[PDB]
Amino acid sequence: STLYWKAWPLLLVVAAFNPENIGLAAWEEYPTLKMLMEMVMTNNYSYPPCTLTDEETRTEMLNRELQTAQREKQEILAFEGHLAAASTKQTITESSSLLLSQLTSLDPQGPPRRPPPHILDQVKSLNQSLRLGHLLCRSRNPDFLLHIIQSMPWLADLVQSSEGSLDVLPVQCLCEFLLHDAAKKRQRQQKQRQLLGRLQDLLLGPKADEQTTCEVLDYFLRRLGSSQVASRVLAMKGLSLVLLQGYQWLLRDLPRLPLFDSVRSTTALALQQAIHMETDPQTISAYLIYLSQHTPVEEQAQHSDLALDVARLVVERSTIMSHLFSKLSPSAASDAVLSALLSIFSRYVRRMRQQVFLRWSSGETATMHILVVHAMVILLTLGPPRADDSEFQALLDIWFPEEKPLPTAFLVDTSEEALLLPDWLKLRMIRSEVLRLVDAALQDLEPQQLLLFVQSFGIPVSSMSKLLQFLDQAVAHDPQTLEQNIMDKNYMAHLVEVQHERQTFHSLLTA
Amino acid sequence: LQFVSPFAFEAMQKVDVVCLASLSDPELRLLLPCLVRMALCAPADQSQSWAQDKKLILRLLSGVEAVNSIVALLSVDFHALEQDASKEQQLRHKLQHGLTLEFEHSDSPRRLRLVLSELLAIMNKVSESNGEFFFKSSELFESPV
């Protein structure tokens, strides 16, 4: 074990000084040495590696190392038992094994092994004394830093240990050092200005070609899709530096690109991913405005995926939606975002009419997704924008038509009718101020659902009056089952009185 | 950020229901969980004056869906959560998504478990820090939304 763990740093230094053949061979063949120069270039000496942020791969490789250590322990115990039976005729146990602490399995190309803490200490001392990450940064070929790039703190300290590699001929590395940068400070500012001018030439200038433009903007989009909020902020900061007044770079400067559509397809896909993963309401608003103005409508698959992604934004991020459309501060930006979403979904609905299969009362037949349908109906609850009302009225007549029944639902696989309006959605309908949505909720209600809807809050007084009327109707229809479903008569009685100051059902509760 | 006003705090401390009615929307939004705990939970006092106080608490509790959120949070099973917390504490003595994303997407019991784990980890970190001040960063607690 001691020879193995002390043998790793010598081969590490040799591979670091000769990365073309020995360094590549260590990168490809030996996972332990591969991890080792990864540690010395990251300056973050941790098992599992900081480069691999994937938790399931971390746990899988940790379990692999644990199984390898257990198998090594069993093999060492068996071999020591054989040697003891040959020499001293003694039984070898776990507490009486010297070869367990003196020996290890010789599998350098197999599974990675846990480095000892003192081994990590001397590796980090060697890295600090000899700047091996700086040597790899000077090493243009092979660029294992760019291989790992294909993560911000180890990048930052690696660059700070390698000030002299500020350019690095790959344009992905140029933008990587740009996101790092986003006497010595003045020199760094001047070199950042030169790199910004170079990238402005590479994106908007006469030398702006498709390959480098796609590489630059795809690197920005993938570091936007990176889960770290600091990474998202740095990526949007770099995008604004190269290019909602804080998002006018995306809304206005970005459409002025020479290669705008050819990058805009990938931009639309990656901003759909960033709508899935994003948290900032204003950045989400900018994303929605940009997609409403710039999504390719031509592809059916892309348009359906866009509608499904906006549906996931509406449903799964209802808290962020509430912050966007808080009734305390009705903003023109929120009005424009609501109009944009209504326009997007209205174009989508026109595309079908021109997973669950829904058929219209007019005879139109298409297969949408119930989450998308809930997204349109939640927009219907969000209500009419102050600017445009035609799209709102058209969608309202599409899903909730006047004096004619709703478009009915069926399953795609089994063709069975499905509940298009769940109980929570009907609760949203009742708490909404639209009379058509309120009445559409009011039809087909169970008495228990009526009880739950009365118990829930946030609902207007007129909807309380209608719910009271429907509860009185349920009393007149079946009082016994409703009384059986009633749990705390005094509690719902006080609730009915409180809504009264906010009759037959109250009399039933008192009886 | 908006801090709790002294008028709101003295109204809460003096439990004056007319004062709580006089307070406006955002401070009541801040003071929701205790008030809804008052209005829903089994009252220790059974006096009729407290009954009118409770119905006025309902009167002011009109208009909030975070009430239903707290209803679900109370519906989570606290005994199982407590014993799991105790076992995790004993283990500590002996997620691809971010924490905010897991808090959002995961349901109320997972939300309680994750905030409990973060609080217990910070408490253990302080107890092992022994008065040495550090900084602990959590995106859930640093996300202003």
XYZ file of C-alpha atoms in Angstrom, chain A residues 349 353 358-361 370 372-382 391-408 419-422 425-430 432 434-443:
57
model
C -54.553 25.922 -30.283
C -57.684 23.047 -34.636
C -59.801 16.135 -26.699
C -62.644 16.616 -29.159
C -64.452 19.926 -29.511
C -68.183 20.545 -29.570
C -53.826 17.981 -19.905
C -51.145 22.367 -21.345
C -54.946 22.579 -21.107
C -54.580 23.463 -17.424
C -52.019 26.101 -18.452
C -54.518 27.797 -20.785
C -57.264 27.579 -18.158
C -54.938 29.010 -15.484
C -54.233 31.895 -17.869
C -58.021 32.238 -18.125
C -58.086 32.608 -14.336
C -55.263 35.163 -14.570
C -56.996 36.399 -27.740
C -58.427 36.095 -24.221
C -62.022 36.078 -25.480
C -61.175 33.600 -28.249
C -59.537 31.174 -25.810
C -62.396 31.626 -23.330
C -64.905 30.754 -26.045
C -62.712 27.813 -27.097
C -62.552 26.074 -23.720
C -65.652 27.498 -21.997
C -68.123 28.273 -24.788
C -71.396 30.045 -24.110
C -74.606 27.921 -23.936
C -72.968 24.835 -25.482
C -70.997 22.039 -23.807
C -67.262 21.873 -23.254
C -64.828 19.967 -25.492
C -64.848 16.452 -24.083
C -61.447 14.377 -15.736
C -60.379 17.551 -17.532
C -61.197 19.745 -14.502
C -59.682 18.468 -11.232
C -58.557 23.527 -10.620
C -62.269 23.957 -9.861
C -61.266 25.573 -6.567
C -59.138 27.945 -8.644
C -62.174 28.527 -10.872
C -64.343 29.467 -7.901
C -61.304 33.389 -9.805
C -64.667 35.121 -14.097
C -68.364 34.223 -14.016
C -68.038 31.658 -16.816
C -65.256 29.813 -14.968
C -67.221 30.032 -11.705
C -70.359 28.521 -13.248
C -68.340 25.878 -15.120
C -66.889 24.840 -11.771
C -70.378 24.959 -10.242
C -71.789 22.341 -12.601
